[PDB]
Design a protein around this ligand. Sequence first.
Ligand SMILES: *Cc1cc2c(cc1C)nc1c(=O)[nH]c(=O)nc-1n2C[C@H](O)[C@H](O)[C@H](O)COP(=O)(O)OP(=O)(O)OC[C@H]1O[C@@H](n2cnc3c(N)ncnc32)[C@H](O)[C@@H]1O
Ligand SMILES: *Cc1cc2c(cc1C)nc1c(=O)[nH]c(=O)nc-1n2C[C@H](O)[C@H](O)[C@H](O)COP(=O)(O)OP(=O)(O)OC[C@H]1O[C@@H](n2cnc3c(N)ncnc32)[C@H](O)[C@@H]1O
Lengths: 550, 550
Amino acid sequence: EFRPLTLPPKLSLSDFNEFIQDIIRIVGSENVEVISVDGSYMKPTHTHDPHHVMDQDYFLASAIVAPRNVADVQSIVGLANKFSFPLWPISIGRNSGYGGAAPRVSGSVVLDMGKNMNRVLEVNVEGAYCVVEPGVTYHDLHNYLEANNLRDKLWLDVPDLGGGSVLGNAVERGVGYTPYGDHWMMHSGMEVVLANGELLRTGMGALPDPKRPETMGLKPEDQPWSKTAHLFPYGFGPYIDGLFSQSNMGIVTKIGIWLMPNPRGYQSYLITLPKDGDLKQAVDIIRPLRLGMALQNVPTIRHILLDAAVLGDKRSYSSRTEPLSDEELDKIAKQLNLGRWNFYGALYGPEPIRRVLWETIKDAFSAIPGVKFYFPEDTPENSVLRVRDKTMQGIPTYDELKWIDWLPNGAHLFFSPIAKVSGEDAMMQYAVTKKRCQEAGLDFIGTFTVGMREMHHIVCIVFNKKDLIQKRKVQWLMRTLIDDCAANGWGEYRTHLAFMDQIMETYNWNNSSFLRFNEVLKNAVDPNGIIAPGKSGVWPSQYSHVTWKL
Amino acid sequence: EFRPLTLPPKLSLSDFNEFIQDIIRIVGSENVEVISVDGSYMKPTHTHDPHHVMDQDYFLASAIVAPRNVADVQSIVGLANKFSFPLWPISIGRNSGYGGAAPRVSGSVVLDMGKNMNRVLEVNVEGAYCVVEPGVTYHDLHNYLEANNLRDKLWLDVPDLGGGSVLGNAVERGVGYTPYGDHWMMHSGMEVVLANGELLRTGMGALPDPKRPETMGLKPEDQPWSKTAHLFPYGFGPYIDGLFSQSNMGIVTKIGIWLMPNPRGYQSYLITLPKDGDLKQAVDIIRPLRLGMALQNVPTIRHILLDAAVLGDKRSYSSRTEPLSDEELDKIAKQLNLGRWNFYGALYGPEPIRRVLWETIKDAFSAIPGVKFYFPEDTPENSVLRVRDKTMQGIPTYDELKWIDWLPNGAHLFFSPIAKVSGEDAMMQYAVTKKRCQEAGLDFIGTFTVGMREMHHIVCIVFNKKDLIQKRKVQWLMRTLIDDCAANGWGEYRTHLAFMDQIMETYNWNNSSFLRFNEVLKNAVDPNGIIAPGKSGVWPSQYSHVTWKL
Ligand SMILES: *Cc1cc2c(cc1C)nc1c(=O)[nH]c(=O)nc-1n2C[C@H](O)[C@H](O)[C@H](O)COP(=O)(O)OP(=O)(O)OC[C@H]1O[C@@H](n2cnc3c(N)ncnc32)[C@H](O)[C@@H]1O
Ligand SMILES: *Cc1cc2c(cc1C)nc1c(=O)[nH]c(=O)nc-1n2C[C@H](O)[C@H](O)[C@H](O)COP(=O)(O)OP(=O)(O)OC[C@H]1O[C@@H](n2cnc3c(N)ncnc32)[C@H](O)[C@@H]1O
C-alpha cells in the first residue's frame, strides 16, 4: 500500500513504500495494513486511542504489522534500523485509559504481536507456572486451563476484565486481586528482541537447556528452557528484567507467569461503609490486617459511584448533567444496599483457617458504625459482589465494562497516584482529587487497591469523547491533578500517552537524575532509537525534547 | 604512603602518589591505608580473601579508603575518573566464601563504605520498614531495635550470621529465614552514586519530598524521601533497581528494607529424617506445602555434617584422612540425635492458625518411617535448633562459625546451584555433587534453602587454606561442579571472585546475549570503566577479555 495519513519523522513517501513492500514480502499482505474507527473492547482498534482525550487522530499509526513468529520481529527490527523507522509493540492493545494501541509517536508501525503469537507454550503443574506469548488473553488462558482439566489444580490472577494480555499487563506492571495480584512480581524468564534485533532470555532463561537429539537445530526462539527458567527469577549477575517493564528497551516475545495452586477453599466478602468519611478509619484498619496477613489478596475499596456505574448509566440514576451531589450518593447507596465506600476481599485455604481470619477481619471492621457484611448469596443477581466473587478466584469476566458507559459516549482515562495505607493520607488524596473533579464538572469515581504497604488509587475519569469542551476539561483535570499530587508527595504509577512526559518530570529528584540515567541506557541499546520512542517520557537522542514532549 | 604492593593496570607510581595525596586530603589520613594478614570474622580484612582458594595475595587491594559521607564518595569517583582508577566498593566485607572484601582486579582501591557510613537512618513503624547505610550490620540494627523497644512491634530477617551488612547482603540478593527471607525483594527506595559521580534514587525515591522551611538548602544526599519512597518499589518508568544487584553499575549509599511486624505467635522446630535417601520424599512433601503457605518462611534442609561440624571439628569424630563413609555418618546421626537430613522450619502468627499448619506438616511428613519432631525445648542446650530458634525470628547469632573449623585452617567456598523443589532434581544435584566431592577428597557438606518454587543448594566446600595440594583440588572441584551442573541444566545464583567469569560463561544461551547486553549497558554508564571491573564476568571495553578472564 502507497499513501498513509502520517509518516514517521524524517521518512519519505518513497522510503515508506519500500519498507511496506519489504514487510509484505516477509509476513504476507494479510498481516499488513496502511492507514490511508474506535472499535470495541471486544474487537480493539490498533490504529489510535479509542478513549481519546486529544483529537481522535492525535496518536495515529502509519500502519499495522502482525509478525507470524519471532523471526518476523527480528526481520522487522532489521528494516526499522535500516530505514530509521519507529516501532510500537502491543500485545493485545486493550490499554484503554492509558492510550489503547496508539503509538506515542504518530507515523509509527504498530506491532500487533498478539494476532499470530498466540500460544500458551507451557503449563507446568509441579512448578505451578505457565509460559506465554503476547496473544494469550486472560480468557484465553482461562480456556486452556478448562480444556486440560487444570482448573482444580491451578488458578489465574485476573485484572478487572478478561481480555487484556497476561504479558501485556505484566510488563505494564498491572494488578489483579488474588494473593498473586502483583503481576509483574509473578514473572520469571522473559524472552525479548532487543533494538539491535538479537534475542535474549532473562534470569535462568540465560542458562540453556542442555543438548539432546529431540531439540537439535531448533531456532533459538523455539528452543525449550532449562528447568529453572520459570522458577528462580534472578538467574546470576545484574538483574535486568525490570528494565523491560514500562520501558521502550525491547520487544517482549514470551514470559513465564507463576500460578496459584487451587488454595483448598475460597470465600469472597463485601463490607459496606456507610459514611463518605468512613474511608479514614477503614484504611487505618486495613493497615495491620494487610501487614499482618489476615488480608490474603489485593482487596479493593470502592467509592459508591463505581458499583452504581456497573449497575446502570447516569441517566438511570438522574437526568442531571452536573456531578451528583453528596446527598444523592447517599440515596444511591441506600437504593443499592451499599455503603459510601465498599470493601471487597476474599479468604483462601481450609475452612479452619478461613474461619479464624474472617473473625479477625469481621471484628476489626465492626468498630466502624453501621458496617454490614455480605457473602455472594446475600446479594441480588446483578451485584458487584457476585461478579468479583469470580474475579478474586481467577475467573475472567466483563461485567465491569459497563461503567465506561456512565456518560453518553463513555471513554475512560485513569489518574493513578499512590497513597500510604493510612486513613489520613488517603483522605487528603481523595480530597485533593474530589475537589478538582468538581471544578471540572465530573462525578468522582475511583478505587483504592490494597498492596502490602501502599494503595493504588485509581481515579476513574469518565467522559463523553464527542464533547470537545469536556475533553479539554479532562486535559485540565489530569494535568492539574498530576501537579497537586506531586506537591503533596505522591507520584503516579502508570499513565496515558499524553501525560507520560509530565509524569516523568515529576520524578525529578536531584535535577531529573532518574530520566537522565534512563536516557543513557536507552541510547546505548537503541542507537537508532527505533523502539517505542517516548514511552514513559524516555526519548532517544534523535528525538528533540522541544519537538516531542507534552 | 608511597610504594604499594600491586598497582592498578596502566597507571604509573607517580600517578598513584598524586592520587592518594588527593584522597588523604579529603578523607584525612585516618581514612587511608596503603598496603605495602588474614584476620578473622570479628575483625574482617579489607585487603584480600581471608578464605583464599587462589594464592593469599592473588586478589589484593592497593589501598583501602574509608569515605566519611556521600560527598567523599562523589569526589573519590570524580578522581577515579580523573586517573582511570578501579574502585572496589564494600559495605562490611564479610562476603567470606565469595572472596570476602577482595577486589576482582588486583590494584583497586577497596572502598570501605561501612567504616563511617554507619547510620540506621530511619525506622518507620506504620510503614514497617527501615532505611539503612552500608555500615549497619544485622547486629547493629538488632541493637537499634532493642534500644528503642521496637522488637515488640517489628522483627528483622537475618542470614546464618549477624555480622553482614543489611544493604550489602541485599544487593548480593542474599537469603534469610523468615517470610522476609528474600532480602532483595524486600528493598524499596535505593540511593546510588553513579560511575559519573551523580546521585540517583530509584522508584519513588525519584519523587521528591515537597519543599518546606526545615529542609531548605540540604545537600541532595541529606534530603528526606517523599512519603512513598520506601512503601512502593516501582515508582514510574523502567524499573532499574535490579541493575544494581550483583552488578558493577554503581555504589549504593542507602537502601530501604521492609520489616515484618511481630506476628503474634512463634514456634520453630526440627524434623529428623533417618536415611540418606530420605531427601527425595522430603522435598516432594515440602513442594505443595511451600506453594500453599503451610510453610511461611524459608526453611532449610541440613546435611548431617553441617550440624555435626557446628558441634565439633572433624578430628573429634574420626581420625581418618579420606572422606567419611556412609556408615560413619549414620554413627554421627544416632550420636547427635539428628537424621541424615534435618529439616528446620518455623510457624508464624496466632495460635488457632499455627496449630492447623503444624498438624498438616506433621501429618505430611509421617509417611517417612522413623521421623521425629522436636521443638527447641526438646533438645540439648547446644543444639542447632536452639540457635536457629533465634535465627528464624530475626535474632543474630555467631554459633554457625564453628563449622568452618571442620578442618585445621578451615576456610569455606560456596558452590550454589539452584534446584527445583522436587526430590528427583534434588537427589540428582546431590549425586552429581557428592561424586565430585569424593574424587577431590572432600566431605560433602551443605544445606538446601526452600524458596517458593526453587531451592538454593549451598554446597559448603571447607578446605585447609594452608595446604597448597588441597587448594588446587578445591579449584579443580569448583570448576568441574560448575560444568557438570550446567550440563544438567542448573546454574549458580552467586559466586566467588575466581569463578565469576566461568559461571557467567555458563549462562550463554544464544551466544552470550545476556553478557553482551550487560556489557553494552556497562560501557554506557561507565565510559572509563572505573566501578568494580569484572564483577559477575561483566568487563568494560578497556579490559581485554584475554588478559582478564579466569
Ligand atoms: C477500561 C478499564 C481498564 C482497566 C480496568 C478496568 C477498566 C474498565 N481494570 C484494570 C485492572 O484492574 N488492573 C489493571 O492493571 N488494569 C486495568 N485496566 C487497564 C487495561 O484494561 C488492562 O490493564 C489491560 O490488560 C492492558 O492492556 P493490554 O494487556 O492488552 O496491553 P497492551 O494493550 O498490549 O499494551 C501494553 C503496553 O505495554 C507495553 N507492551 C505490551 N506488549 C509488549 C511487548 N510485546 N513488548 C514490549 N512492550 C510491550 C507497551 O508499552 C504497550 O503500550
Ligand atoms: C562464612 C559463612 C557465610 C555465609 C553463611 C554462613 C557462613 C558460615 N550463610 C549465609 C546465609 O545464610 N545467607 C547469605 O546471604 N550469606 C551467607 N553467608 C555469606 C556471607 O557471609 C554473607 O552473605 C554476608 O552478609 C555478605 O557479606 P557482607 O554483608 O559484609 O557484604 P560485603 O562484603 O560488603 O559485599 C558483598 C558484595 O556486595 C557488593 N556490594 C556491597 N556493598 C556495595 C555497595 N554499597 N555498592 C556496590 N556494591 C556493593 C560488592 O560486590 C561486594 O563484593
